[PDB]
């Protein structure tokens, strides 16, 4: 039940999958996401990406593993890993439901109005 | 370009199609819409429906034709008709683009994460 999936939920999904694939780093993040959706036409908002990431952090799903760049003064390389992988898979499942409902909704609108 | 279609835009689309079909009345409106989406799981918000309708009115796309209920004290039967049908078809076309992009977006998320 509900309308379509929200943008934060959508981005959080990708971040969880990326973490699953050991490819979730802080630096490339926004750029990697934007590059992933420029073909279709979606440009992930800057603050949306940041808020998605931190909600996953504050909610205890992800945690940040850090290593210092021996080449740059201050700041580090941030790798994200699961802190609570069970919670993540639970989230993923909820998201699957949202995505399926969204698809149906969009499809119905296309056939009903066009 | 953009994320998914907004709820107001989505409802406005249906109202335009309904008007096209001479079936857009003020009374049954919210209930008719909610009945149209209860199978999938979307329950159109009360104020969303009202705001969609009035944006179409204030934007000059629709106009209200009214007749008094000889059976009820005060208030009337409201039929909606196009005031600017060209503007409506223009809106419909924009909406088609939004819906197609939304579909692609949802589909990509399903295959990329599941």
Curated annotation (Swiss-Prot), chains A, B:
Keywords: DNA-binding. The keyword DNA-binding applies. Coiled coil: none annotated. One of its GO terms (molecular function) is DNA binding. The keyword DNA-binding applies. Signal peptide: none annotated. GO terms for biological process: DNA replication termination. Pfam families: RTP (PF02334). It comes from the Bacteria. Gene3D superfamilies: Winged helix-like DNA-binding domain superfamily/Winged helix DNA-binding domain. Plays a role in DNA replication and termination (fork arrest mechanism). Two dimers of rtp bind to the two inverted repeat regions (IRI and IRII) present in the termination site. The binding of each dimer is centered on an 8 bp direct repeat. Homodimer. This is Replication termination protein. The gene is rtp.
